[PDB]
């Protein structure tokens, strides 16, 4: 491998004194002949031969944005294949044709302003880098200088600038192609003649990008939502491949392999993915993570991810070369069916995804804390839950695009990215301000709507530059208190998550806690249920509290019982919530929605109608239920029990609130769940009563870790059970009677 | 109940303006008639009638120490029964007889200096308290003043002094009868006429005693060894009963109920208890915790503890009255047989006791970290292990008393209470001092022997006054890193404990870690095994490292195998330890022992031969094995595998050391166990190979909590398993092959 040296205060690999070193080294060159003859890889080579053809004037848009370049055609493809051919034959004149065909265009290329033009520019730099490195020994001394100058000229055009001192290192445009693929690629190629570019680009990557990613990688997830995952993660994977193939091995935390597992857990039976962050909706074509699946699966030799890639093994034209260079065509492939039904993502996330299966009958439930906010495409949705069953039931509302506009739309700023769009909690301080001066790249606004929701972190709702700035700022939004699933790893009866999300809100609250308990009921009539226990303490009793439940179609409210159904688009799922706390005498349950109220925010509706032929299921939503206390008080508690079944189901389980000693709980089906009445650690004896036939499965939470003793009807049932630290919980089986717990 | 009021800066209950309030209130008085007619409580009443008889001159010792008074006879018993009779009949002249019979003696009683005389003095005060309170309405005004004065005179004689400002509040004489029973009792009785005594005595209890006990109670154990448990804990239980019966409810952490469970777990099949702290040995009569079992069992209505009491329901004479007053004769009783085979005691202890059963064939293994030292009767034994099977095998060596002397003996100071007496670790710094100027009440010595062991905390090896001083001192000796047992709670295949005990030693070390893994092999030929993995980093490579294994009889050393047998006193157990690390080329294994070397400490043997007719089995020990590296180095590791079986078992389990990627481990029987090679958190992929037939049970420790993936032979075995925070472990079954773990 390469030598690692301290450059500008950081340990970094130095590009080896050898060519090629871009995307491969000498030793992989002889294998190109074999990859060429590989059946699997010859469609992709044929594709590249076809890309050599120039655009047809009748198809060339007037605005050539990133899509025009990413759909790479013509000269740049031709020179790349000459460079490749020179690699494989070393015929001097082939290397000459490559160099002479690209040099002049590289020097003079101009790019009219347009959507993400830096992507087109950067791709043009990559073509130059490929030739420079692959045909290096054919370069004349003057040609070397000309390339360098051209490379600098182009780099100055990028959003990150050159030096690359602009934008952000965890999110934003600089967390995409420009540094991790483009600048890096060129830096490596021209290092021997002009080391500055590498020193600067890789310097920022190693100092900032790598540090931030290695920080959250261990919890196997990403923070930009289910769409931005593609572009953002794809680029992490480019840096991974580029530096590895350069000879620096793997520079990322190996946990990087399992990040995409999240996308797998979130796949619906209808080809789409569970919502999260900036996303739009469609029902016309399945959603794919092709490139990340290719790069991650082929590097880490992961069959689950390769299965993901193989669903649609069709890369964007500009990435075809990298599939040809890097794809592992001998790697096996695995359906997700044998994967455990729940997966936990820890700090700084605190996320649980829980399923009842892997097919068309599976319930898919998401529960989130959010210890930190990464902003950009992430939403202020700490504490949010989302449930899908034969259709989206408890939904993550709003849409990224629509009639309102794009990223900068009032809809994004005032609803979509805000708490009120999610199944979370609102405490309304009428005098609270929400500074948004830093949000977006244009059409800025000083303040966003007051939604009674969570803070906008950063300098006017704008992401920090790096982890350094992030940790020193106000981006902490929560603290994971407890978590766990069991008793079986494979098919857990329950999935538990608790967070303190006080830090997500302003000083308008003193304490905001949420405990999720999802139940896999192992039952046909009623496959699943979710229990949500909330403690909210406002600094002013007069700050109105809201508990939100979003849906597509209009909910039915009958007393304490809310029914949500899917009846469209082939969806037939149903959701029924029993409101337990506050009690009947202190509970107001209302629904807001329909046209003019689908995106309602204390006065104003932030209209965002679907663009033509998009979101045919209206998953952006139209309705929400609001539960609010009748009486103004500082401290309040929410207790809600959601059941999930087919919409034709008439008889669900009856729910009982359990009132015991120091505990409040729920009993439905054959399950019992308890929480501390004040949602604090129970460090003293407590107890409650159970009435009902058969055997029940108990989950007791909020318990001081250590040895507990369980008595029933005055007699010892379990002489000693252990509550553990990660969940602070007890699980056991038992029948009806009066229970006592000793600690 | 009573009113709680804040006296001298603490919240504390005020004695009610009513009599009686000592040991009972009006409402329990009518029940005394029933208790009198209770069959179970008649023998105890008859006993008390017999105690009324005075000593016979031919039996009165010339030194009347605490035993002379605790074996209470004569006048004081008579007046107590007259007070009791007055309670039950309210015949004015009975109350008068009680008062007039005791008043003189109380005023003039003198006590010649002798062993723990404060115990006799305090008992005399209790008799006065009983009369004063129970016969209060018969007291003349001048008699009240006389009592008060007499009570003060007597209280000034106590070791704690009066005011009770002397000695210690977590250990020592002041953690016995004098405050928690005696001063407290008198204070309550005379509160209306002289509240100072209660204010002062209860003051210290509530400010100091209670705070310290409530601090460690939650982990259900005690810190003074298996003998001092009686007197020390009994007195905690007196304060419990006295304040409760006064009307203040339970002032202790309810965790108090389960402390004695420890004694139950440590009971051998021969009637004795596993060693720990200051203890002596006998094989003539079973060991009992009668009084603690009585008070704790009857107060908390615990059948397990009542069973303990009923084994020998024979209370010391001076405690007969309290059995009559407080014993629950209707309470049920339980053998320990249904109790889980392992029990964990957390902070500030970090102790695991693990068994294979509850009868004559049970192995009993103890594993200790020690996060703090309480001194007094506790030993400097952080990291120590002890194993019993059909006899004491890996022993806790030395003896409390013997030819050397008592508490102050050179044997106690230089061996018994020191690391070298235990199965732990030594790092010999030849220039280290061990200050002992504060140890003991007499015959003080400035310095104790250098045993290469653990520090002597406190001001010259003397306990702190209270928790306040303790936490601010140098009494921290360890940190629990991980713990756990499973997979089944009832009959765990493994019991795991890991601690960093660096703080137990001086700066002569940088790092000292010990991981215990006990295996219940569920096997007739070889019931159990213990694996011990040690990391030791010295500040000077030249500081000789020792790994200790103590035994009664002479060990056999054959290469890397050490065999220890019991062949005496009906004991037939055997221990075989396979030394894995250091390896053969860096391992020295020697034994020291026999006469002149049984208590050997780098130059000197601290002889302590048994007193006549004591320790028939010589459990004080005679031998130890020392394992030391051949080469001087700063960092060293010990890996030792102990198997346990009958001394007739000829063939044991073959032991294999597992050398893998980032991990070291053990394979024996059907068990696989691994540790981080540096005993650090493994946060990267790791692997190793397993060769052998059949299914194996795996326990991988030192892992980063999160989702792990297990492959073998290059294929997915387990797609996702969860290592939890408390144990940092993975557990699963598998057959032979090449294993790889991903995180
Ligand atoms: C740090 C920070 O907050 N930065 C903000 C920028 O993020 C933001 O820039 C806008 O970012 C969006 C974006 O979604 O990333 C750009 O949208 C364009 O690129 C995306 C992703 O490639 C396109 O989206 C998708 O289309 C498809 C598809 O057609 O199949 C696949 C993906 O799943 C889907 O998400 C999107 O169509 C592009 N839109 C264009 C070209 O108009 C914006 O271009 C970009 O401006 C700025 C905005 O002001 O604010 C920063 O603060
Ligand atoms: C804070 C501190 O460190 N204080 C030190 C004192 O603890 C210490 O005082 C000595 O403490 C011992 C002790 O063991 O507690 C006293 O021993 C006497 O009392 C104990 C308990 O009642 C007797 O022990 C029991 O004997 C029997 C039995 O008779 O069947 C069974 C029990 O299992 C066993 O524990 C012990 O026998 C008593 N002594 C005698 C001679 O009979 C000492 O009297 C007491 O001095 C002092 C010592 O200098 O040092 C302080 O620093
Ligand atoms: Zn959202
Ligand atoms: Zn000891």
> Each residue of A598-633: b (16+ CB within 10 Å) or e?
bbbbeeebbbbbbeeebbebbbbbbbbbbbbbeeee
Rounded distance from Cα A454 to ligand 1 centre (Å)? 24
Token pair recorded at residue A156:
């100055």
> Does B726 sit within 8 Å of A724, measured CB to CB?
yes
Cβ neighbours for B229, distance < 8 A, ≥ 6 positions apart: B222, B263, B289, B292
What phi, psi does B513 have (nearest 5°)? Answer: -125, 145
d(CA B474, CA B339): 37
What phi, psi does A145 have (nearest 5°)? Answer: -60, -40
> Each residue of A97-136: b (16+ CB within 10 Å) or e?
bbbebbbeebeebeeeebebbbbbbbbbbbbbbbbbbbbb
Cβ neighbours for A359, distance < 8 A, ≥ 6 positions apart: A269
A715 bridge partner residues: A712
d(CA A21, CA A34): 20
For residue B272, the tally of other CB atoms under 10 A from its CB is 21
Token pair recorded at residue B492:
């765990």
Token pair recorded at residue B330:
């209707």
For residue A171, the tally of other CB atoms under 10 A from its CB is 22
d(CA A115, CA B134): 95
SS3 state of residue B551: strand
Cβ–ligand 2 contact at B61 (below 6 Å): no
**Does residue B534 have a cis bond before it (omega within 30 degrees)?**
no
B639 bridge partner residues: B533, B581
Axis-axis angle for helices B92-108, B141-155 (nearest 10): 40
CA-angle at A347, arms to A345 and A349, nearest 5°: 60
> Each residue of A362-401: b (16+ CB within 10 Å) or e?
bbbbbbbbbbbbbbbbbbbbbbbbbbbbbbbbbbbbbbbb
Cβ neighbours for B240, distance < 8 A, ≥ 6 positions apart: B250, B251, B252, B256, B295, B299
d(CA B702, CA B369): 17
Of A489, A725, A742, which is closest to B254 when you measure between CB atoms? A742
Is A540 exposed, middle or buried, given 0-12, 13-18 or 19+ CB atoms closer than 10 A? Answer: exposed
Rounded distance from Cα A435 to ligand 1 centre (Å)? 22
d(CA A564, CA A393): 7
Total length of chain B: 743
d(CA A308, CA B321): 78
Q: DSSP code of A403?
A: T
Instruction: Please give the number of the atom of ligand 2 that sits closest to the Cα of B376.
Output: 3
Resolution in Å, one decimal place: 2.1
**Does residue A487 have a cis bond before it (omega within 30 degrees)?**
yes
Helices (H), A461-545: 467-471
What DSSP letter does each residue of B388-444 carry, written as one string?
ESSSEEE---S-SSBTTBSTTSHHIIIIITSGGGSSSEEEE-TT---B-TTSSSSS-
What phi, psi does B622 have (nearest 5°)? Answer: -145, -15
Token pair recorded at residue B202:
């209860």
What DSSP letter does each residue of A459-471 carry, written as one string?
TTS---SSHHHHH
Among protein residues, the one whose CA lies closest to atom 39 of ligand 1: A115
For residue A92, the tally of other CB atoms under 10 A from its CB is 12
> Which of A28, A22, A5 is closest to A83 using CA atoms?
A22
Q: Is A1 on the interface with B (CB under 8 A)?
A: no
SS3 state of residue B148: helix
Residues of B in contact with A726 (CB under 8 A): 705, 724-726
Is the dihedral angle over the CA atoms A683, B172, B179, B290 positive or is it negative?
A: positive
Is A505 exposed, middle or buried, given 0-12, 13-18 or 19+ CB atoms closer than 10 A? Answer: buried
Q: In this structure, are strands B544-551 and B623-629 parallel, antiparallel, or unpaired?
A: antiparallel
Cα distances (Å, whole numbers) of residue B428 to B420, B454, B586? 11, 10, 18
Q: Choose, out of B255, B297, B345, the residue to mutate when testing the contact with A (most A CBs < 10 Å).
A: B255
CB A187 within 8 A of CB A163: no
CB A260 within 8 A of CB A298: no
Is B739 exposed, middle or buried, given 0-12, 13-18 or 19+ CB atoms closer than 10 A? Answer: buried
What is the H or E stretch that residue A392 is in? strand A392-394
CB A209 within 8 A of CB A180: yes
Cβ–ligand 1 contact at A408 (below 6 Å): yes
CB B169 within 8 A of CB B159: no
> Which of A690, A429, A691 is closest to A541 using CA atoms?
A429
Annotate A488-526 with three-state secondary structure: CCCCCCEEEEEEECHHHCCCCEEEEEEEEEEEECCCCCC
d(CA A232, CA A235): 6
Cα distances (Å, whole numbers) of residue B404 to B413, B598, B609? 11, 13, 7
Total length of chain A: 743
What phi, psi does B214 have (nearest 5°)? Answer: -65, -20
Rounded distance from Cα A423 to ligand 3 centre (Å)? 9
For residue B662, the tally of other CB atoms under 10 A from its CB is 18
User: In CATH, what class is A328-647?
Assistant: mainly beta
Cβ–ligand 1 contact at A116 (below 6 Å): yes
User: In CATH, what class is B648-743?
Assistant: mainly beta
For residue A693, the tally of other CB atoms under 10 A from its CB is 8
A649 bridge partner residues: none
d(CA A258, CA A269): 21
CB-based contacts of A104-112 (< 8 A; 24+ apart in sequence): A105/A75, A106/A147, A106/A150, A106/A151, A106/A154, A107/A146, A107/A149, A107/A150, A107/A153, A109/A154, A111/A157, A112/A63, A112/A64
Q: In this structure, are strands A635-646 and B561-565 parallel, antiparallel, or unpaired?
A: unpaired
B387 bridge partner residues: B365, B394
Annotate B648-714 with three-state secondary structure: CCCCCCCCEEEECECEEEEEECCEEEEEECCCCCECCCEEEEECCCCCEEEEECCECCEEEEEEECC
CB B735 within 8 A of CB B696: yes
E strands within B506-551?
Answer: 509-520, 528-538, 544-551
> Each residue of B469-485: b (16+ CB within 10 Å) or e?
bbeeeebbbbbbbbbbb
Rounded distance from Cα A354 to ligand 3 centre (Å)? 18
**Does residue A163 have a cis bond before it (omega within 30 degrees)?**
yes
> Which of A581, A575, A524, A525 is closest to A549 using CA atoms?
A575
> Which of A406, A414, A419 is closest to A436 using CA atoms?
A414
Q: How far apart are the first and last CA of chain B?
A: 57
d(CA A437, CA B2): 61
Method of elucidation = X-ray
CB A269 within 8 A of CB A362: yes
d(CA B45, CA B50): 9
Token pair recorded at residue B532:
């011990």
Annotate B276-311 with three-state secondary structure: CCCCCCCCCCCCCCHHHHHHHHHHHCCHHHHHHHHC
Token pair recorded at residue B504:
């137990």
Q: DSSP code of A29?
A: G
Q: DSSP code of B319?
A: G
Give the torsion through C-alpha atoms of A346, A348, A349, A352, to 10 deg: 10
User: What ranges do the domains of chain A cover?
Assistant: 1-327, 328-647, 648-743
Axis-axis angle for helices A92-108, A75-89 (nearest 10): 150
**Does residue A348 have a cis bond before it (omega within 30 degrees)?**
yes
How far from the centroid of its chain's Cα atoms is residue B737's Cα? 45
d(CA B578, CA B256): 40
Token pair recorded at residue B497:
């404990």
Among protein residues, the one whose CA lies closest to atom 22 of ligand 2: B231
Cβ neighbours for A472, distance < 8 A, ≥ 6 positions apart: none
SS percent in chain B: helix, strand, coil, step 5 = 30, 25, 45
> Does B743 sit within 8 Å of A726, measured CB to CB?
no
> Does A489 sit within 8 Å of B707, measured CB to CB?
no
Cβ–ligand 1 contact at A115 (below 6 Å): yes
CB B260 within 8 A of CB B335: no
HSE-CB at B70 with a 13 A cutoff on CA atoms is 12
> Does B704 sit within 8 Å of A218, measured CB to CB?
yes
> Each residue of A302-331: b (16+ CB within 10 Å) or e?
bbbbbbbbebebebebbbbbbbbbbbbeeb
Token pair recorded at residue B376:
């007094």
Residues 128-187 of A with CB under 8 A from B: none
Of A220, A304, A742, which is closest to B257 when you measure between CB atoms? A742
Instruction: Please give the number of the atom of ligand 2 that sits closest to the Cα of B443.
Output: 49
Report chain A's C-alpha Rg in angstroms: 28
**Does residue A582 have a cis bond before it (omega within 30 degrees)?**
yes
d(CA A217, CA B567): 58
What phi, psi does B18 have (nearest 5°)? Answer: -160, 150
> Each residue of B155-176: b (16+ CB within 10 Å) or e?
bebbbbebbbeebbbbbbbbbb
SS3 state of residue A538: strand
Q: Which CATH number fits domain B1-327: 3.90.950.20, 1.10.10.10, 1.50.10.100, 1.20.140.10?
A: 1.50.10.100
Helices (H), A74-189: 75-89, 92-108, 118-134, 141-155, 177, 184-189
E strands within A539-670?
Answer: 544-551, 556-558, 561-565, 573-581, 587-593, 600-601, 604-605, 623-629, 635-646, 656-659, 663-668
CB B688 within 8 A of CB B712: no
d(CA B199, CA B13): 10
Token pair recorded at residue A566:
């899917």
d(CA A206, CA A75): 34
Residues of A in contact with B340 (CB under 8 A): 719-720
d(CA B64, CA B112): 8
Of B683, B720, B725, which is closest to A343 when you measure between CB atoms? B720
Instruction: Please give the number of the atom of ligand 1 that sits closest to the Cα of A463.
Output: 1
Nearest C-alpha in B relative to A340: B720
Cβ neighbours for A166, distance < 8 A, ≥ 6 positions apart: A159, A160, A174
Q: Is A741 on the interface with B (CB under 8 A)?
A: no
- Determine the distance in angstroms separating the CA of A222 from the nearest CA of chain B, rounded to an integer: 16
Q: DSSP code of A738?
A: E
Of B339, B343, B706, which is closest to A218 when you measure between CB atoms? B706
Q: Is B487 on the interface with A (CB under 8 A)?
A: no
For residue A485, the tally of other CB atoms under 10 A from its CB is 24
Axis-axis angle for helices A141-155, A118-134 (nearest 10): 160
d(CA A239, CA A245): 10
Ligand number nearest to the C-alpha of B119: 2
d(CA B671, CA B659): 15
Token pair recorded at residue A367:
């529960």
What is the H or E stretch that residue B243 is in? helix B225-243
Is the dihedral angle over the CA atoms A345, A346, A349, A355 positive or is it negative?
A: positive
Q: Is A630 on the interface with B (CB under 8 A)?
A: no
SS3 state of residue A129: helix
> Does A705 sit within 8 Å of B346, measured CB to CB?
yes
d(CA B160, CA B118): 9
CB A388 within 8 A of CB A268: yes
Q: Choose, out of B302, B349, B719, B730, the residue to mutate when testing the contact with A (most A CBs < 10 Å).
A: B719
How far from the centroid of its chain's Cα atoms is residue A105's Cα? 39
Rounded distance from Cα B562 to ligand 1 centre (Å)? 70
> Which of A276, A470, A290 is closest to A377 using CA atoms?
A276
Q: In this structure, are strands B587-593 and B623-629 parallel, antiparallel, or unpaired?
A: antiparallel
d(CA A645, CA B414): 72
**Does residue B20 have a cis bond before it (omega within 30 degrees)?**
yes
CA-angle at A315, arms to A311 and A318, nearest 5°: 175
Question: Among all chains, which residue has been given the structure tokens 């939502």?
Answer: A225
């Amino acid at each position: 491998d390469v030598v690692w040296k301290d450059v500008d205060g950081v340990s970094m690999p130095i590009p080896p004194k050898t060519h090629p070193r871009l995307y491969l080294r000498e030793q992989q060159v002889p294998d190109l002949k074999n990859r060429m003859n590989d059946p699997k890889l010859k469609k992709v080579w044929a594709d590249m031969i076809k890309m050599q053809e120039d655009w047809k004037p009748a198809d060339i848009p007037e605005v050539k944005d990133f899509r025009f370049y990413f759909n790479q055609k013509g000269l740049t493809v031709r020179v790349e294949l000459m460079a490749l051919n020179y690699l494989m034959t070393k015929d001097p004149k082939v290397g000459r044709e490559a160099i002479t065909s690209i040099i002049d265009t590289l020097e003079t290329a101009t790019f009219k302003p347009a959507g993400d033009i830096s992507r087109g520019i950067g791709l043009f730099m990559v073509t130059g880098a490929i030739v420079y490195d692959w045909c290096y020994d054919q370069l004349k001394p003057e040609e070397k200088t000309r390339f360098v100058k051209a490379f600098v000229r182009l780099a100055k055009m990028l959003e990150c600038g050159y030096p690359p001192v602009k934008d952000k290192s965890i999110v934003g445009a600089a967390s995409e192609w420009m540094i991790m693929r483009d600048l890096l690629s060129v830096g490596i190629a021209i290092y021997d003649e002009f080391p500055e570019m590498y020193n600067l680009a890789a310097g920022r990557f190693f100092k900032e990008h790598l540090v931030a990613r290695n920080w959250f990688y261990p919890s196997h997830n990403y923070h930009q939502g289910m769409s931005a995952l593609n572009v953002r993660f794809t680029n992490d994977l480019f840096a991974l491949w580029i530096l590895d193939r350069m000879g620096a091995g793997n520079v990322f935390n190996p946990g990087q392999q399992f990040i995409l597992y999240d996308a797998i857990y979130k796949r619906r039976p209808d080809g789409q993915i569970l919502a999260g962050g900036d996303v739009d909706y469609s029902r016309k074509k399945p959603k794919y993570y092709t490139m990340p699946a290719l790069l991650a699966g082929s590097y880490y030799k992961d069959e689950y991810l390769n299965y993901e890639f193989l669903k649609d093994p069709n890369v964007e034209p500009h990435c075809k070369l990298f599939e040809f260079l890097w794809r592992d065509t001998q790697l096996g492939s695995r359906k997700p069916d044998d994967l455990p039904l729940s997966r936990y993502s820890g700090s700084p996330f605190g996320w649980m995804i829980a399923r009842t299966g892997w097919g068309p009958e599976s319930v898919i439930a998401e529960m989130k804390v959010n210890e930190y906010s990464f902003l950009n495409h992430q939403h202020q949705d700490a504490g949010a839950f989302q449930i899908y069953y034969k259709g989206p039931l408890a939904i993550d509302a709003g849409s990224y695009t629509g009639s309102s506009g794009g990223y900068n739309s009032p809809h994004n700023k005032n609803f979509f990215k805000r708490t009120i769009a999610h199944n979370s909690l609102l405490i309304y301080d009428p005098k609270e301000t929400f500074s948004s001066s830093g949000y977006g790249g244009s059409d800025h606004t000083d303040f966003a709507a007051n939604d009674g929701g969570q803070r906008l972190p950063g300098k006017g709702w704008i992401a920090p530059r790096d982890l350094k700035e992030m940790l020193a700022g106000d981006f902490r939004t929560g603290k994971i208190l407890a978590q766990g699933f069991g008793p079986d790893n494979q098919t857990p009866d329950y999935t538990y998550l608790k967070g303190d999300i006080t830090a997500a809100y302003s000083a308008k609250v003193k304490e905001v806690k949420r405990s999720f308990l999802f139940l896999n009921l192992k039952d046909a009539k009623v496959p699943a249920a979710m229990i949500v226990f909330d403690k909210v303490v406002a600094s002013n009793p007069d700050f109105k509290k809201f508990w939100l439940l979003h849906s597509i179609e209009q909910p039915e409210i009958k007393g304490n019982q809310i029914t949500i159904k899917r009846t469209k688009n082939g969806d037939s799922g149903m959701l029924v919530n029993t409101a337990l706390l506050p009690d009947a005498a202190n509970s107001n349950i209302t629904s807001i929605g329909g046209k003019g109220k689908d995106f309602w925010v204390f006065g104003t509706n932030y209209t965002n109608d679907p663009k033509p032929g998009t979101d045919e299921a209206l998953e952006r939503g139209e309705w929400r239920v609001e539960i609010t206390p009748k009486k103004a008080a500082a401290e309040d508690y929410y207790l809600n029990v959601i059941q999930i079944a087919d919409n034709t189901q008439q008889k669900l389980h009856e729910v009982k609130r359990i009132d015991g000693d120091k505990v409040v709980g729920v009993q439905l089906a054959d399950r019992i769940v308890t929480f501390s009445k004040t949602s604090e650690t129970v460090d003293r004896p407590f107890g409650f009563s159970v009435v009902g036939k058969g055997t029940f499965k108990f989950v007791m939470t909020d318990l001081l870790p250590g040895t507990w003793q369980v008595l029933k009807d005055g007699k010892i049932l379990y002489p000693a059970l252990s509550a553990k630290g990660d969940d602070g919980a007890l699980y056991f089986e038992g029948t009806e009677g009066t229970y006592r717990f000793l600690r």
